[PDB]
């Protein structure tokens, strides 16, 4: 058995991806090789991939896509790329054409879960509660269906990149410009405040099993990039201090969304809890995978050790 782990990527989450790879590479219970996609899109293989991992960032790569990799040597490919060109169905599509089994969601589910506009449309249709929002296209005059404050974001982003809180309409233009640096489509959501952030892990193909629910607490105005990756800045409460009904509703909604979207392998489902009301914020098909990341910790609290979690992910990819 041999697994190919791909990390890095051209998205803003390149460094976060390499961090996830470090954690996975240390506990994955299978012979595994690492391939790195540099920020310039060129791949780094073998020892150069390991050298990049140790550097924590690979600006330049050697091989133009597609890389001269002996794909036949791998039983499963574990795409550990976060964000566009990795978690959005693009890499998945390549793997489908290659006929290679891989970890995580397929093309449709990956593309849909990454889009903060379309995912909300599908979930709402299924009766899942979501935050009021509207999509805005670059070059299209914005007409927000509700008053501020808002959270403006690239429709496809991660690690809070390109996201900002907007208090007045006159500040919307600049917030959208920032979002458009990352995507041609942005979303403007009604800002919930105060808000509690709950996250739950799901494991399995389509019909999943839920981990305990966790909660994120911090002092910053919102769960931004520095708060997300600065160890100890955020507080992860596992399990989250929720009453039984709310805990169960979070887990049930997560499994429902997971099934409707047809997610395979895994997903960390994040929610907002405000004034006793729950909202499914987003599903993450390739959640941060450091041993300390939320998804791994969640399942650890659920009796599934890090090595065992990775084993199951690989096995699910083969069924």
* Alpha-carbon gap, residue 81 to 64, rounded angstroms: 17
What residues contact 82, with CB distance under 8 A and at least 6 apart?
Answer: 9, 11, 13, 16, 17, 20, 158, 159, 286, 288
Residues that are catalytic: 13, 159, 293
Tell me: does residue 104 bind a copy of itself (CB under 8 A): no
Tell which one of 105, 112, 192, 280 touches a copy of itself (CB under 8 A): 112
Tell me: does residue 141 bind a copy of itself (CB under 8 A): no
Tell me: does residue 156 bind a copy of itself (CB under 8 A): yes
Tell me: does residue 90 bind a copy of itself (CB under 8 A): yes
284 in a labelled binding site: yes
Q: What is the DSSP letter of 293?
A: S
40 in a labelled binding site: no
Residue 33 has φ and ψ, to the nearest 5°, of -110, 155
Stretch near Mg ion under the rule CB under 5 A, chosen from 10-18, 38-46, 65-73, 280-288 = 280-288
Looking at the Cβ atoms of 77 and 163, the one nearer to ligand ADP is: 163
User: Which of a copy of itself, Mg ion, ligand ADP, none does residue 99 bind to, with CB < 5 to 8 Å depending on kind?
Assistant: a copy of itself
Tell me: does residue 165 bind a copy of itself (CB under 8 A): no
Tell me: does residue 197 bind ligand ADP (CB under 6 A): yes
Query: DSSP assignment of 91-143, as one string?
Result: HHHHHHHHT--BSS--HHHHHHHH-TTHHHHHHHHTT-----EEEEETTS---
Tally DSSP H helices, then E strands, for the chain.
10, 13
Tell me: does residue 183 bind ligand ADP (CB under 6 A): no
Tabulate helix, strand, coil % of the chain (nearest 5).
35, 25, 45
Helix axes 14-27, 46-55, angle to 10 degrees: 110
Integer CA distances (angstroms), 80 to 21, 93, 149, 259, 286, in order: 7, 15, 34, 22, 7
Looking at the Cβ atoms of 224 and 270, the one nearer to Mg ion is: 270
Tell me: does residue 197 bind a copy of itself (CB under 8 A): no
Tell which one of 158, 162, 201, 212 touches Mg ion (CB under 5 A): 158
- The CA dihedral of 128, 103, 87, 199, to the nearest 10 degrees, is 40
* Alpha-carbon gap, residue 19 to 23, rounded angstroms: 7
**Smallest distance, Mg ion to C-beta of residue 261, A:** 14
- Contacts with a copy of itself by CB under 8 A lie at 41, 65-66, 85, 88-94, 96-99, 107-108, 111-112, 114-115, 118, 121-122, 124-126, 135, 137, 140, 156, 184-185, 206-207, 259-262
Chain residues binding ligand ADP by CB under 6 A are 131, 151, 153, 157-160, 163, 189, 191-192, 195, 197, 222-223, 270, 272, 281-282
**Annotated binding-site positions:** 147-198, 270, 282, 284
């Amino acid at each position: 058995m041999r697994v190919l782990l791909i990390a890095g990527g051209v998205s803003p989450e390149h460094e976060v991806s390499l961090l996830s790879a470090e954690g996975v590479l240390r506990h994955i219970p299978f012979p595994t090789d690492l391939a790195v996609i540099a920020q310039d899109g060129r791949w780094l293989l073998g020892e150069k991939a390991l050298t990049a991992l140790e550097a924590k960032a690979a600006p330049e790569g050697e091989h133009p896509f597609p890389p001269p990799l002996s794909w036949e040597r791998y039983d499963v490919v574990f795409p550990l790329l976060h964000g566009r060109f990795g978690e959005d169905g693009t890499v998945q599509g390549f793997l489908e054409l290659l006929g290679k089994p891989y970890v995580g969601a397929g093309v449709a589910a990956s593309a849909l879960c990454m889009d903060k506009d379309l995912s909300k449309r599908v979930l709402a249709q299924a009766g899942v509660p979501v935050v009021p929002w509207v999509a805005v296209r670059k070059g299209e005059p914005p007409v927000v269906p509700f008053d501020p404050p808002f959270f403006v974001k690239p429709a496809n982003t991660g690690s809070s990149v390109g996201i900002s809180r907007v208090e007045r309409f006159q500040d919307l233009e600049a917030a959208l410009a920032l979002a458009f640096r990352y995507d041609e489509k942005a979303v403007v959501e009604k800002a919930l405040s105060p808000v509690r952030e709950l996250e739950v892990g799901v494991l399995g193909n389509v019909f999943g099993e839920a981990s305990p629910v966790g909660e994120v607490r911090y002092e910053a105005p919102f769960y931004d990039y520095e708060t997300k990756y600065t160890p100890g800045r955020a507080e992860l409460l596992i399990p989250a201090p929720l009453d039984p009904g709310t805990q169960e509703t979070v887990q049930e909604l997560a499994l429902k969304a997971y099934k409707v979207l047809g997610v395979r392998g895994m997903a960390r489902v994040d929610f907002f809890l405000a004034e006793g009301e729950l909202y499914l914020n987003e599903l993450n098909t390739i959640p941060g995978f450091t041993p300390t990341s939320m998804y791994p910790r969640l399942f650890e609290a659920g009796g599934v050790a890090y090595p065992e979690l990775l084993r199951r992910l690989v096995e699910l990819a083969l069924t």
